Write a protein that binds this ligand. Structure first.
Ligand SMILES: [Zn+2]
Ligand SMILES: [Zn+2]
Ligand SMILES: [Zn+2]
Lengths: 77, 61
């Protein structure tokens, strides 16, 4: 069932995303691209001190309602 | 030198909060404990930048 998470973005603003626990990290980056315009391959996501891996789900990290993620940019290439 | 610019502790050891304490690099070629720079980035209310050189932050790798 759906939930909101919070994402702190590189420009300094916190945005929200509508997600599902079964959503993949790739799915989440796609949503972030829609909102922030950052290409998924230039996105790095962290939950606490965990870097989130493509192929994994939000539930795999026990990311929950109103959990907060940090979004940073990766150098292209 | 051989110390994390944020916590001023050696790269080959843990950050003050630490255990796996990996190192990361900015495009500006400054190195930090991952935990240190994450703590800094999280606190920033403006565009993410290096604590040392104030260049725009991007993780190299
Ligand atoms: Zn450090
Ligand atoms: Zn550490
Ligand atoms: Zn720097």
């Amino acid at each position: 069932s759906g939930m909101q998470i919070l994402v702190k973005t590189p420009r300094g603003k916190t945005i929200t995303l509508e997600v599902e626990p079964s959503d993949t990290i790739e799915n989440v980056k796609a949503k972030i691209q829609d909102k922030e315009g950052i290409p998924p391959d230039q996105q790095i996501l962290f939950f606490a001190v965990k870097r989130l891996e493509d192929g994994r789900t939000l539930s795999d990290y026990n990311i929950q309602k109103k959990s907060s993620l940090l979004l940073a940019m990766r150098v292209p290439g | 030198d051989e110390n994390c610019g944020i916590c001023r502790m050696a790269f080959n050891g843990c950050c003050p909060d630490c255990d796996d304490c990996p190192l990361v690099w900015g495009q500006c070629s400054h190195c930090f404990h991952m935990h240190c720079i994450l703590k800094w980035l999280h606190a920033q209310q403006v565009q993410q930048h290096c604590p040392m050189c104030r260049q725009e932050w991007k993780f190299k790798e």
